[PDB]
Amino acid sequence: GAMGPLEEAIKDVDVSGVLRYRYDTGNFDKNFLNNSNLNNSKQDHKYRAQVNFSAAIADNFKAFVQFDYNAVDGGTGATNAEKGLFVRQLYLTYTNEDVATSVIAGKQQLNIIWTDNGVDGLVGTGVKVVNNSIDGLTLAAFAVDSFMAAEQGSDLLGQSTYVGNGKNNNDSFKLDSIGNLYGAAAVGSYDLAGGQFNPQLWLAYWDQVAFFYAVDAAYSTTIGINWTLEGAYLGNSLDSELDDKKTYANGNLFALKGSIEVNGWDASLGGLYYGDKEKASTVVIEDQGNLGSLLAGEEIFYTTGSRLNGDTGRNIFGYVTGGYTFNETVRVGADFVYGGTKTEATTHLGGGKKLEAVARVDYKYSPKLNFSAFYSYVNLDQGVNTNESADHSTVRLQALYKF
Amino acid sequence: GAMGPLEEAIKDVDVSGVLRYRYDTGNFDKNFLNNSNLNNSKQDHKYRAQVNFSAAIADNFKAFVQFDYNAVDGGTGATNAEKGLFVRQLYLTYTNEDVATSVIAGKQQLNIIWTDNGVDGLVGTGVKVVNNSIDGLTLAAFAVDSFMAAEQGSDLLGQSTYVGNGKNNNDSFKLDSIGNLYGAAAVGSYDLAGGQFNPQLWLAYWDQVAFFYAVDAAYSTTIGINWTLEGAYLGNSLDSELDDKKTYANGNLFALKGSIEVNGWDASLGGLYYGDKEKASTVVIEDQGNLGSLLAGEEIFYTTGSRLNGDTGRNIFGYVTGGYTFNETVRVGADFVYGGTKTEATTHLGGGKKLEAVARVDYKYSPKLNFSAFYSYVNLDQGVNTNESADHSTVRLQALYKF
Amino acid sequence: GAMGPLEEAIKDVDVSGVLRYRYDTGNFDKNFLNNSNLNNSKQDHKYRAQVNFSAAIADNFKAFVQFDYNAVDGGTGATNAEKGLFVRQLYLTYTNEDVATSVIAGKQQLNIIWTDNGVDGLVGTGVKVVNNSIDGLTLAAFAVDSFMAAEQGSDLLGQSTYVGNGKNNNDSFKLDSIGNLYGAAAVGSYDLAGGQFNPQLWLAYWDQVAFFYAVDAAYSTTIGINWTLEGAYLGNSLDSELDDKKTYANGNLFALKGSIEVNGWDASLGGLYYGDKEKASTVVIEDQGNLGSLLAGEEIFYTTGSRLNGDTGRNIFGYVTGGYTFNETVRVGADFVYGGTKTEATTHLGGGKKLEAVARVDYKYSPKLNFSAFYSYVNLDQGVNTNESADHSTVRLQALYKF
Ligand SMILES: CCCCCCCC
Ligand SMILES: CCCCCCCC
Ligand SMILES: CCCCCCCC
Ligand SMILES: CCCCCCCC
Ligand SMILES: CCCCCCCC
Ligand SMILES: CCCCCCCC
Ligand SMILES: CCCCCCCC
Ligand SMILES: CCCCCCCC
Ligand SMILES: CCCCCCCC
Ligand SMILES: CCCCCCCC
Ligand SMILES: CCCCCCCC
Ligand SMILES: CCCCCCCC
Ligand SMILES: [Ca+2]
Ligand SMILES: [Ca+2]
Ligand SMILES: [Ca+2]
């Protein structure tokens, strides 16, 4: 067949992507409760690259593809990854401008409130309809019939484990099967006089799993003293398949955070309440959902009993964060998170008071290239032996390039 | 080493490709004779993408590469494919303009009359010499020393099976080994006064398999009333390795088709005769060869006894097709195929009268983007229980983008 | 997220690469000592492609990636490779121009004197600092914490085997584990009046393996009669882990080569001395290191007893090469290598006199596209049965494109 110049063909195509290097080390003393989600890296060199292409195919049609490279070179003792790129997203977008509506069909990162919306977000295959007729307001309905589960491993509900009672692979939240996911969302962004108001409502029926419902409201000023306030409730009501088992509970999470910025300083204060004393519950579908703005620390919400994607235990946490930014370039800062998990089990496995301190540096070298580092210290008041405390420390150096 | 700008490097390069989505569902009632070639999709999302690059490397030399992505996301009950692209073709082309001759060497889609010439055509590694000294006439000689067999699965002769006699994997046409393939072809395209005449002659020796010979002639007018007439004979004579087994027969296929187009209407009428009553034979090497213009329906020639790439049974079929094209944009149409398979086996497995009706819609959204759909109904007069009939229905929705 | 035009994005990017086809056949008579490194190809079609991209990411920062395709289509009897591309190198380069210094971190081809610096060079992950403050002089320090070992197979020290004493997989140089590699180098290139002088010094500590030290000096005139002289010493001192085993010896290699070119003729003369009579030693880390300019022939230094990446036996070799270049386009030439291996083992396995003759053609079709061929004949005076000689012949046709 005929072939046209590559130079002509690329004119039709937009591109973006990410290149991320992490060097992670996570140590644990003997008494620490370990699990599939805590950082167990031993001086690993981790690379994650994604390149996204979007091509205007025909009038009102776009095709999108994402290639992903996800690899680790071991530091001490040691693999050196030999991997290629995989097609991580592949979809078609139809846009009818006359009614401000788009239909997105195929393998796509889901980007819902209960999944990670970043680099490593849950992917699935389905259809999404998005309407933007009302200025500031995005309305969406979606249906998903399969999930790219394997790539996520322990991030996905039902695929995480924890160590305890002579077993290394206790199932945090047992899921025998999963159905389609149907839902809808209303997401607002309104520029008001004093600042910007971002309310969201999300509803979703995940067949065989649960009915999920979430409401969030954020308000953010834009003047000297800038401040934000954000609150969220996420709950779910279990499907009968799980309800009949009597060892699960409906999910509830309440969260509130305030923050302030002035003269290069920033601080934040917040809290959250979630989980059940005696029964396994979940807040999100994958990892920490899109809840990053309402959490703090790095490792504490991965501790057994406190995970947001399946665990037993009632959690209450408060936190404060603060830092100073030199020259709008280098921010040095810290997080302190304190709280605990209440358990009804006689073992109280995962229970007790928990604390995390994190020292942070973030260096914005250019608008596209950011270097960062953290040192996280987590302390459990009750470890494997519950009458003794336990420490876990994690160090990360990261380079992050976006284009 | 030194590196030049990507922007300079791409000037040397031509590109083409295909993006195809299919949503297929194929149902079978209990009495239907199933096999490795009938459509057994259950609401599968199938993606096939190919991107071809050709670069002028030096005076008179081109290098070509094809990347292929071939993946399925399961609909009901469900995988979500995590696959990359593979190098499906990789070859060098030398062109001597002074004698209108080219030499093509390496891993290349074969594109012979006995293989599929489309997206999913048999690939092999070898050499091809093509001469175009005589206007309208292409002469070629070729030699192939290995085949990309695994990618083709049941499309390839010797790799198909059928269900029957308490067994799920009966071998349609047993091939213990295969040798090199040598052949030659003369392909004509002549613009005459009334229209265009396309005769072809193909000869090939496939060591350990058979000697293949095919002649085809097509004539196609170009005025109101436009019409085409095409006839073909394909035969083969088995190599001694198979001849000695006494359970195989030499292949013979005769085919004829006429078509007419007027005022947005089109119709076609044709027939074919192929196979042996009692012994296994073949017509093509892979799938349906390049015989698509001489067949109709979708699933009927995949029924056990009727496959063109290895089966037992003497087949006679007639068909008619027709449709109307609105606005040169949307064609609604239908196929009716009727005939049967004569078997000498006491079981008459695969035998009996067979029928297929297909309803079609084809929507040419742009010159490059085509949407299409079919609903196929196949009826066997003799099923697994031979004194009862059997139905098989297949629905496909397809989006096809070519560039 | 927002996406910019691909056409803009590529402006930031430099590219280079290689496309190589080899057709190799290596025959052995019954008495030949075979091993994991001799050419055992049977009319194999071998493809190796690499494409390298380097992008300016930010002020003073570059990111580099190499994609590799390494595949074989079998000739006689026969696979047809279905493989994609893998990320073979991935690294960041920081350059401070004020002090003529660069820091290179990540997965990178090592390119040290003890590894192949060509297409198939050892890759590892680590850090390199390179200083070019003194004109002509490059100073470097490096640290490597993991090796891409699997890709190299028998090229890597500790991963080669040989046939003998009723066993097919005798370990040439047994390595139970390997540590980090730290080293430094000083590499000079000085344009003097008469020509160019290229001295090198390399030092490296490979934990658990050995301390390596190498000095090389090359001198090359640039007038009628042009000539080169080059000498090298490479030695190593074994780490205690191997020293304690008493079956290994410290490495020593001495080499000298002279060459001359006049009126389209070229010739060279050289010699080398390396290895230990009774104990396993090595010269390089991977394949033949960067020693290609000090060797001749094709297969002789792969014979059991003579490998430069782990073997037992004391080797002494001399060689002469010569050829004529027609029109600065086609060189026809030959290599003759003669010597032997002294062994203290009662079997004298790998020992005896050894000879190689190679006939060569090299055709420079364009500056970027080179065709080449060789016919190599190797003769062992002592084969598997030591009182009988043994032959091994190897034919290669190659096409090589660089951009
Ligand atoms: C030459 C037409 C534009 C090509 C678009 C690329 C399709 C993935
Ligand atoms: C209406 C805003 C969401 C609910 C906030 C809950 C905070 C305790
Ligand atoms: C709107 C109040 C923000 C609270 C921030 C307090 C952090 C010390
Ligand atoms: C700042 C801490 C608030 C919540 C602590 C709960 C302690 C069990
Ligand atoms: C910069 C020269 C052209 C590059 C051709 C690409 C080779 C695959
Ligand atoms: C000469 C044309 C090919 C043979 C046609 C056979 C149709 C019955
Ligand atoms: C040349 C005759 C064409 C026959 C078409 C008939 C279909 C009804
Ligand atoms: C239109 C039908 C022609 C061939 C039918 C053969 C029936 C066994
Ligand atoms: C559009 C900015 C340049 C892109 C560089 C490519 C990164 C791998
Ligand atoms: C000083 C140059 C390296 C040593 C040469 C050894 C040649 C026998
Ligand atoms: C400097 C002397 C070069 C020696 C070359 C001799 C080859 C016959
Ligand atoms: C030209 C040959 C020099 C070295 C030969 C050594 C013979 C054992
Ligand atoms: Ca994730
Ligand atoms: Ca096929
Ligand atoms: Ca190598």
Residue numbers in the entry:
A (entry chain A), B (entry chain A), C (entry chain A): 1 to 77, 81 to 226, 229 to 408
The authors write:
The structure of the overexpressed selenomethionine (SeMet) variant MOMP was solved using single-wavelength anomalous diffraction to provide initial phases, which were improved by density modification. This structure was then used to solve the high-resolution structure of MOMP purified from an E. coli overexpression system (rMOMP). Our discussion focuses on the higher-resolution rMOMP structure (2.1 Å). In rMOMP, however, due to cloning artifacts, we have three additional non-native residues after signal peptide cleavage (Gly-Ala-Met), followed by a single point mutation of Thr1 to Gly. We observed additional electron density adjacent to L3 and L4 that we identify as a Ca2 + (rather than Zn2 + or Mg2+, or K+ or Na+) based on electron density and coordination (distance and geometry). The proteins expressed in E. coli have not had any Ca2 + ion added and we conclude that the ion was bound during expression in E. coli and has remained attached in throughput purification. The ion has octahedral coordination, with one oxygen atom from the side chain of Asp120, Gln152, Asp155, and Glu288, and has the carbonyl of Asp120 with a water molecule filling the final sixth position. The metal ion creates a cross-link among L3, L4, and L6. Additionally, the difference electron density map showed a residual elongated density that was modeled as an ethylene glycol like the molecule [from polyethylene glycol (PEG) 400 or C8E4] in the rMOMP. This molecule sits below the constriction zone underneath L3. Although only one monomer is present in the asymmetric unit, analysis of the crystal packing reveals a trimeric arrangement reminiscent of that seen in OmpC and OmpF.
In contrast to E. coli, C. jejuni has only one major outer membrane protein (MOMP), which is thus far present in all isolates and is highly (but not absolutely) conserved in other Campylobacteria. MOMP is an 18-stranded antiparallel β-barrel porin with an elliptical shape common to other 18-stranded porins. Unusually for an 18-stranded β-barrel, MOMP adopts the same trimeric arrangement as seen for OmpF and OmpC, which are 16-stranded β-barrels. The most striking difference between MOMP and OmpF/OmpC from E. coli is the presence of a Ca2 +-binding site in the constriction zone of MOMP.
